[PDB]
Design a protein around this ligand. Structure first.
Ligand SMILES: Nc1ncnc2c1ncn2[C@@H]1O[C@H](COP(=O)(O)OP(=O)(O)NP(=O)(O)O)[C@@H](O)[C@H]1O
Ligand SMILES: [Mg+2]
Length: 529
């Protein structure tokens, strides 16, 4: 039911209900046979799967109490710190006390006792996390298996059938160019059936080939697909055209952070703004780091605003998923934004991203990078020398807390850097610079940005072809490029496609069952087409 524009001038297709018409259930047999029946994926991570599992649970008063609990815990997490004691006590009384009618017995009383004791002490936002996990361990059992046998999972297969339909020349319509650079250009585009607006990043095949950017283009695609964060650009579709590869991404047309820092004419902006952006960037980093993925490229150009003034981390090409327990090596990044441990070509973890966060907070407030001026003629090896050998200084533009968090993130030794300890991001979140920020509310979108941007408008009369075309492969004995094109163009990406259906209310309007006897014709096995 959520929507905002990329400037969506046309709405859904008048024929959208035909385009998105469910297959008869008899056409889902191959899906039924091949689908991995994995509770976490099917009933939680996949948005439509989560919705249909909950619809199933609400038909059973005995399962519905578990869903209510999980929803209460969600409410608890965003409760103001001072009121957690009351909200927690209410949850305890309602769900975790056998006297109550909505009592949930499958949370072990040893877990309840643990929770009751933590609740006596200083309550924290994560108080109920162990209980919640216990609930899912129950639900992934018999309730899940009942779900798989219900009309709600049948309906899930129908949605999955739709999801996996190919991207074609008719899937999108094209709007104006948003920007140009890198391997290509970015233009606005819209899914015809749903009306949802996206950015289409068009990578020219000839430019990828010349610069040998195949592995990086593929890497960006694969990390984008696996990260689902409100603070990282999402990938909804990946496909091929004759001359290009297309990444269909979250449209972020509010302008990049480099533009906004230097648009002022008095570079740098108010601490309240920098605070908000830094908080969202941190959440984005935590989401990547949860996948043990190090970004490595933080800099203002790679942070984009949307029309609401929220931000996302963009440009994942240099990101790397680190194998668990390992460290990685490579000297990559932008000059002036590379951490000392990167410059020194040491083995490193997630730590460079905290250095990057310090660079960003510093630049947002000062209006200049810590180690270089924006108008300066300086060799890269000198910029590198400054980063290694000199300390940054702080003008009157910095509050004590801003100076402090910048110094702690710009700690040259990674071992002592803020955020790089046991606590990881938690240490950064509790810094005085952020003392007034409730990060759970921020994550949940409950905090309004202090600044709303003018939507970006570029003049470009070039409109490049983004119509899907599957090129004939293997024309040459060397088919390495073709292999790459095939690997890249996997079509729709599950979680964003499902969110697109939900946000545009295609799900709400299309997802309907029979009146009382409650089997609709598309689920009725006695009448195949
Ligand atoms: N999701 C998006 N929504 C809107 N505009 C975007 C989006 N992604 C990128 N852009 C803009 O499109 C332009 C090109 O971006 P990009 O393809 O990353 O090349 P670049 O930033 O100019 N150079 P590079 O350093 O290689 O990333 C820039 O102005 C971006 O801000
Ligand atoms: Mg870029």
């Amino acid at each position: 039911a959520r929507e905002g524009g990329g400037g969506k001038r046309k709405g859904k297709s008048k024929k959208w209900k035909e385009i998105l018409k469910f297959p008869h259930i008899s056409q889902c047999e191959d899906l039924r046979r091949t689908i991995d029946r994995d509770y976490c994926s099917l009933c939680d991570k996949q948005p439509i799967g989560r919705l249909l599992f909950r619809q199933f649970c609400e038909t059973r008063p005995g399962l519905e109490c578990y869903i209510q609990f999980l929803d209460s815990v969600a409410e608890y997490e965003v409760t103001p710190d001072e009121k957690l004691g009351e909200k927690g006590k209410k949850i305890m009384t309602k769900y975790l006390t056998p006297k109550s009618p909505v009592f949930i017995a499958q949370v072990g009383q040893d877990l309840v006792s643990q929770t009751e004791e933590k609740l006596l002490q200083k309550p924290c936002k994560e108080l109920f996390s162990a209980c919640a996990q216990s609930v899912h361990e129950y639900l992934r059992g018999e309730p899940f298996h009942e779900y798989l046998d219900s009309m709600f999972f049948d309906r899930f297969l129908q949605w999955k059938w739709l999801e996996r339909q190919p991207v074609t020349k008719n899937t999108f319509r094209q709007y104006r160019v948003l920007g140009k650079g890198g391997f290509g250009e970015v233009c606005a585009c819209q899914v015809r059936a749903t009306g949802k607006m996206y950015a289409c990043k068009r990578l020219e095949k000839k430019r990828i080939k010349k610069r040998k950017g195949e592995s990086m283009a593929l890497n960006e695609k694969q990390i984008l697909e696996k990260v689902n964060s409100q603070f990282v650009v999402n990938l909804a579709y990946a496909y091929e055209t004759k001359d290009a590869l297309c990444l269909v991404l979250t449209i972020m047309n509010g302008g990049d952070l480099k533009f906004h820092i230097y648009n002022m004419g008095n570079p740098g902006f108010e601490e309240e703004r920098a605070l908000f952006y830094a908080a969202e960037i941190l959440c984005g980093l935590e989401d990547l780091h949860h996948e043990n993925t190090v970004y490595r490229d933080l800099k203002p150009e790679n942070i984009l605003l949307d029309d609401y003034g929220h931000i996302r981390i963009s440009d994942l090409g240099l990101a790397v998923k680190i194998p668990e327990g390992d460290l990685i090596r490579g000297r990559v990044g932008t000059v002036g934004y590379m951490a000392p441990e990167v410059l020194n070509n040491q083995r490193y973890g997630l730590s460079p991203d905290y250095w990057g966060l310090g660079c960003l907070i510093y630049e947002m407030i000062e209006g200049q990078s810590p180690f270089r001026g924006r108008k300066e003629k300086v060799k890269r090896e000198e910029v590198d020398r400054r980063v290694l050998e000199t300390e940054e200084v702080y003008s009157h533009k910095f509050s004590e807390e801003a100076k402090s968090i910048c110094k702690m993130l710009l700690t040259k030794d990674a071992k002592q850097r803020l955020g790089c300890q046991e606590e990881e991001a938690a240490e950064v979140k509790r810094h005085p610079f952020f003392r007034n920020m409730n990060f759970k509310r921020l994550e949940a979108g409950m905090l309004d940005p202090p600044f709303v941007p003018d939507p970006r408008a570029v003049y470009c009369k070039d409109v490049l072809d983004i119509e899907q075309f599957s090129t004939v492969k293997g024309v040459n004995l060397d088919h390495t490029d073709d292999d790459f094109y095939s690997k890249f163009s996997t079509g729709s990406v599950s979680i964003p496609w499902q969110n697109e259906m939900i946000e545009t209310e295609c799900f709400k309007e299309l997802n309907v069952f029979g009146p009382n006897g409650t089997l609709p014709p598309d689920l009725n096995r006695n009448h195949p087409p």
